[PDB]
């Protein structure tokens, strides 16, 4: 499945940085699609195409000559417009559907104790939930079958940068005789929830 | 600006001086691939993705040529207004729960990078280390600055203290993020 790219238009005739990008905003699959290209010089977007407007618009004064010229040439304006179909819709239905949109990586779930156990003394359990994809996830702590919300803290979603995520969930607790603590994880890659238990 | 998914199907970045270019695809904040502009190959972040999908690197190389040309034009057009340096910030975290004795990976996440020229290095007990080191490409941010991650393979030990060292034009002295 071949991906296709946005095509940068040619600008009209101590450090400098230029950036160009084509962004495809998908909502409910390809039912709603919005397409925006951006042209950026030293952090300032100066011209852009937006499928909601249907033509290039200058964003600042620097972009005036480009937007007018690009819009005036049918070959340039039509090729940019067509990118909503030929890039966004095409990439989603082809390559994305068989790669990104199908990736399902199961969380490793492990329970750790912060300090050495001592009955009737305060301590912390950490539920480490790691290496999962995609991002949607639910983690909950239970003590003896009842949901705990007090003394519970989760990190934000941690993006590893290698197409997996991580979330660590701490529970401040005091281990007594016979109580069992359970970390409960639900994720689209799991037919049924993962439950891991730590017996006091 | 709201969506279930965002594909960035072509990010082109060019810098002067130095003729420094980068070409990448992102989907929902992760890198699909970059195009290696010297070897002229598409390099997928996940090798399994590259077995199912493909991209012709010439699509990236021609985009880089346009953007090289546009930079020259926009530089003159703006009276050679130069880029303003930012101060990057680092965060250091392990990939897996740390267990003494067991191989793991330290990740240094560096944000607010602009311009996207940076040196990210690792210190173990203040001495240079580079085991299994890998860096991502520069990722785009909404404010047109960048972020980037570096990885270091390491064996956790209480006798070992780590630093992520970041050097950038927007920093008077190198910043060390301790872990």
């Amino acid at each position, epitope marked *: 499945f071949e991906a296709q790219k946005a095509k940068a238009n040619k600008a009209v005739d101590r450090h400098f940085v230029y950036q160009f990008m084509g962004e495809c905003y998908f909502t409910d699959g390809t039912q709603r699609i919005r397409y925006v290209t951006r042209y950026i010089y030293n952090r300032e977007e100066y011209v852009r195409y937006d499928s909601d407007v249907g033509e290039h618009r200058a964003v600042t004064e620097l972009g005036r000559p480009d937007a007018e010229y690009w819009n005036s040439q049918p070959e340039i304006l039509e090729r940019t417009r067509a990118e909503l179909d030929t890039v966004c819709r095409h990439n989603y239905e082809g390559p994305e559907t068989h790669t990104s949109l199908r990736r399902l990586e199961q969380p490793n779930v492990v329970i750790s104790l912060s300090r050495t156990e001592a009955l009737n003394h305060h301590n912390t359990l950490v539920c480490s939930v790691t290496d999962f994809y995609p991002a949607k996830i639910k983690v909950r702590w239970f003590r003896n079958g009842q949901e705990e919300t007090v003394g519970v803290s989760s990190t934000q979603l941690i993006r590893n940068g290698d197409w997996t995520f991580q979330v660590l969930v701490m529970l401040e607790m005091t281990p007594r005789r016979g109580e069992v603590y359970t970390c409960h994880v639900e994720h689209p890659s799991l037919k049924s929830p993962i439950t891991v238990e730590w017996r006091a | 600006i709201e969506a279930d998914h965002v594909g960035t199907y072509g990010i082109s970045v060019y810098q002067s001086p130095g003729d420094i270019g980068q070409y990448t695809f992102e989907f929902d904040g992760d890198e699909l691939f970059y195009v290696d502009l010297d070897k*002229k190959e598409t390099v997928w972040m996940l090798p399994e993705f590259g077995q199912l999908a493909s991209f012709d690197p010439q699509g990236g190389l021609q985009n880089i040529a346009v953007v090289k040309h546009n930079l020259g034009v926009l530089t003159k057009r703006s009276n050679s207004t130069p880029a303003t340096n930012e101060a990057p910030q680092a965060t250091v975290f392990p990939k897996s729960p740390v267990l003494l004795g067991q191989p793991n990976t330290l990740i240094c996440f560096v944000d607010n990078i602009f311009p996207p020229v940076i040196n990210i290095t690792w210190l173990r007990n203040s001495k240079s280390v580079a085991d299994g080191v890998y860096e991502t490409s520069f990722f785009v941010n909404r404010d047109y600055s960048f972020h980037k991650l570096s990885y270091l393979t390491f064996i956790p030990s209480d006798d070992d203290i780590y630093d992520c060292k970041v050097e950038h034009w927007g920093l008077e002295e190198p910043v060390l993020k301790h872990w």
Partner: T-cell receptor, first 109, second 111 residues
């Protein structure tokens, strides 16, 4: 691969000349025909995008069949001045072309 | 316009041949092709701008040079008889729907 047939075609003046082309790669989305007279370089004659099944311009028409990955250039009311070599080419993503081997057309008076 | 130079040339095997092409179209992309009966228009090398070149379908035996936006040269360092052909240069815009060809260069490489 872009394949043209026949390699050489002779047609009577006034008859419709039919030049066939086919391709392998289904991503191909742009199909320009180039006309080359003896001793000169080729020049773009007429072109079609995979979204259309027909492109007409004067005496020249392209008929395009995406499913079969087949393509045809019809020249109506052919004139001795139409004698030339005709090249079919294809593009994807507006990257570079790949030319067919060309079909030589001779119009007999 | 796209001008090729020279238009005809006889060379000896082992000889060095340079074919030069100049365009005044303000185009960014330039291309070098050969044409031979039974092979059609085969792309040898191309270029998106000064200082860079890209391989075509049949780059072997050929080096390309783009010293400026206007000029694109094809260099045959060790000419062989199989490089006997008619060569065409073309220029076009970024992503261009249209190539603009020169008039051709007849090259004979003789033992």
């Amino acid at each position: 691969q872009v394949r043209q047939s026949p390699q050489s075609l002779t047609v009577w003046e006034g008859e419709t000349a039919i030049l066939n082309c086919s391709y392998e790669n289904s991503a191909f989305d742009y199909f320009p025909w180039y006309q080359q007279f003896p001793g000169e370089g080729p020049a773009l004659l007429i072109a079609i995008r995979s979204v259309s099944d027909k492109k007409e311009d004067g005496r020249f028409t392209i008929f395009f069949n995406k499913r079969e990955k087949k393509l045809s250039l019809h020249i109506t009311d052919s004139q001795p001045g139409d004698s030339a070599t005709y090249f079919c080419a294809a593009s994807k993503g507006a990257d570079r072309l790949t030319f067919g081997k060309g079909t030589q057309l001779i119009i007999q008076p | 316009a796209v001008t090729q130079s020279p238009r005809n040339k006889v060379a000896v095997t082992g000889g060095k041949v340079t074919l030069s092409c100049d365009q005044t179209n303000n185009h960014n992309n330039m291309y070098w092709y050969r044409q031979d009966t039974g092979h059609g228009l085969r792309l040898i090398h191309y270029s998106y701008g000064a200082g860079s070149t890209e391989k075509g379908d049949i780059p072997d035996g050929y080096k390309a040079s783009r010293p400026s936006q206007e000029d694109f040269s094809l260099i045959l360092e060790l000419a062989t008889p199989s490089q006997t052909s008619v060569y065409f240069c073309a220029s076009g815009d970024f992503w261009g729907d249209t190539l603009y060809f020169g008039a051709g260069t007849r090259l004979s490489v003789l033992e």
